[PDB]
Amino acid sequence: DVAAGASVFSANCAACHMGGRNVIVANKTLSKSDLAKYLKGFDDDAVAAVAYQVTNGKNAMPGFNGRLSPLQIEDVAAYVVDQAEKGW
Numbered sequence: 018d019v020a021a022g023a024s025v026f027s028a029n030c031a032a033c034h035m036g037g038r039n040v041i042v043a044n045k046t047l048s049k050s051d052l053a054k055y056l057k058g059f060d061d062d063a064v065a066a067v068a069y070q071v072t073n074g075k076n077a078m079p080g081f082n083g084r085l086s087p088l089q090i091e092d093v094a095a096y097v098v099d100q101a102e103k104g105w
């Protein structure tokens with residue numbers, strides 16, 4: 018689950034979120050704080066909130082709804098939440 022999410026992450030996310038940052042929008046990192054400050058519902062269900070932004074995305078953040086499977090999405094989400102909580 019988290020090991021799978023790691024692979025989905027480096028194959029589809031590392032390009033912009035290397036080390037849990039945000040090369041495009043500097044202040045929109047994948048840190049615990051940022052995910053809390055900007056991700057709706059994050060403080061309700063962390064993985065679900067991340068899985069949401071991943072499926073739909075916004076602005077410069079592309080959606081993966083057609084490219085990734087629901088399973089691959091829940092996996093990268095758990096991985097991200099895991100990394101945020103651990104500090105990357």
Ligand code: HEC
Nearest residue numbers: 029030033041042045046051052055067070076077078093
């Ligand atoms: C570069 C083109 C990106 C790729 C490919 C992915 N993401 Fe992204 N992400 C990007 C931007 C420009 C932004 C911010 C957009 C905005 O204005 O809101 C984001 C944001 C996120 C977030 C929330 C970050 C925060 O506000 O703290 C999440 C949860 C996120 N991105 C996850 C993520 C994952 C798992 C990806 C791989 C499938 C991924 N992103 C790819 C730009 C880019």
